């Protein structure tokens, strides 16, 4: 499974849903996540991130193994992205700062 991490929240740019074959991203209010069980790891979107917040499960960097099991869990109650849409307004303000985890919104 891949994994959306960190710098994805505040920034939700959207190009990664596009790119997805089979539609396992779910969408958040400033955030999204990745299924973990409908993802078949074709690792088409991690190139596409322009926050580069998605990595390979195995590749997951050491501070950011929470979010492992945050994409599984709020993957069952968010709703399925299938279209684009636009960046957040502020997004590229938001991309790079770090810590972004305590402004997540359910
Ligand atoms: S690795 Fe492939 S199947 Fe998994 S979320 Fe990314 S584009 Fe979709
Ligand atoms: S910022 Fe987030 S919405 Fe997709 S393009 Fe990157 S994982």
Same mark, same amino acid.
């Given at each position: 499974?891949? #994994? ?6 505040? =920034?939700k *740019? =959207?190009d990664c849903?596009? #790119?997805?074959?089979?539609? =396992?991203? *779910?969408?958040?209010?400033?955030? &999204?996540?990745?299924?973990? %069980?409908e993802?078949?790891?074709?690792? &088409? ?5 322009? !926050?580069? !917040?998605?990595?390979?499960? %195995? @590749? #997951?960097?050491?501070?950011?193994? @929470?979010?492992?099991? /945050?994409?599984?869990? &709020? !993957? ?16 590229? %303000? ?6 972004? /985890?305590?402004? &997540?919104?359910?």
């Amino acid at each position: 499974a891949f #994994v959306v991490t960190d710098n994805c929240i505040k =920034c939700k *740019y =959207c190009d990664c849903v596009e #790119v997805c074959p089979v539609d =396992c991203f *779910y969408e958040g209010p400033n955030f &999204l996540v990745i299924h973990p %069980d409908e993802c078949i790891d074709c690792a &088409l979107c991690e190139p596409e991130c322009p !926050a580069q !917040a998605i990595f390979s499960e %195995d @590749e #997951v960097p050491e501070d950011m193994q @929470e979010f492992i099991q /945050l994409n599984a869990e &709020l !993957a069952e109650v968010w709703p399925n992205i299938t279209e684009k849409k636009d960046p957040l307004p502020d997004a590229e %303000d938001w991309d790079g700062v770090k810590g972004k /985890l305590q402004h &997540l919104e359910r």
